[PDB]
Amino acid sequence: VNSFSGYLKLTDNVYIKNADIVEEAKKVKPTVVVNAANVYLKHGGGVAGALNKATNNAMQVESDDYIATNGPLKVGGSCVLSGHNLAKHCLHVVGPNVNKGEDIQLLKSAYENFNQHEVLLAPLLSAGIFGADPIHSLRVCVDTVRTNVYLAVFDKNLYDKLVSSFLEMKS
């Protein structure tokens, strides 16, 4: 388990790889894969849709059952459900939807949930459908997370941009 390979070490606890999070999860077998979730755990597109699709929709059914007895998550909040065939556990974390004016400071709260887990395979929270700048999401991850986070960025051009601007800013 947690056999991560081919990552660029950004800090003592943050790693980044140009990879699709589903394919990484199948290779690595992480204890925790992170979902970029929304408060009702409707796994439509992006990471959530890809993770759910790779579980043959088991993640959505599990999530419906969770919501039915617990109600929606809060923005910046999280829950631990099954990792299905992809991981031991999936940490569903709700970043703020910046497009709808949700407070971008909640991205800090979202990444704080990573600190409850020794090691995680994760995407850049809020950087896709939710409209936060990916460079900002990476910065918040680096400053907030103290546990071992392995970031999967599937798009090569975004990966190159993220690494370049991480170096520039780091000084």
Ligand X SMILES: CCOP(=O)(O)OP(=O)(O)OC[C@H]1O[C@@H](n2cnc3c(N)ncnc32)[C@H](O)[C@@H]1O
Query: Between 56 and 171, whose beta carbon lies closer to ligand X?
Result: 56
Question: How far apart are CB 130 and ligand X at their closest, in Å?
Answer: 4
Nearest Cα residue to 123 out of 94, 92, 153, 102: 153
Is 4 among the residues that bind ligand X (CB under 6 A)? no
Is-contact 29 87, C-beta < 8 A?
yes
Residues 20-39, interacting with ligand X (CB under 6 A): 20-22, 36, 38
Q: Six-digit token pair at 45?
A: 């597109």
Is 73 among the residues that bind ligand X (CB under 6 A)? no
Query: Within 13 A of 85's CA, how many CA atoms are on the CB side?
Result: 12
Is-contact 93 140, C-beta < 8 A?
no
Provide CB contacts within 8 A for 71, sequence distance 6+. Answer: none
State the number of binding residues for ligand X (CB under 6 A).
Answer: 22
Query: Between 125 and 141, whose beta carbon lies closer to ligand X?
Result: 125
Question: How far apart are CB 114 and ligand X at their closest, in Å?
Answer: 14
Binding range to ligand X, per CB under 6 A, among 72-80, 100-108, 120-128, 138-146: 120-128
Is 126 among the residues that bind ligand X (CB under 6 A)? yes
Place of tokens 């051009």: 157
Query: Between 57 and 171, whose beta carbon lies closer to ligand X?
Result: 57
Q: How far apart are CA 156 and CA 141, in angstroms?
A: 20
Nearest Cα residue to 100 out of 122, 131, 123, 78: 131
Query: Between 94 and 171, whose beta carbon lies closer to ligand X?
Result: 94
User: Which residues would be at the binding site for ligand X (CB under 6 A)?
Assistant: 20-22, 36, 38, 46-48, 50, 95, 123-130, 134, 152-154
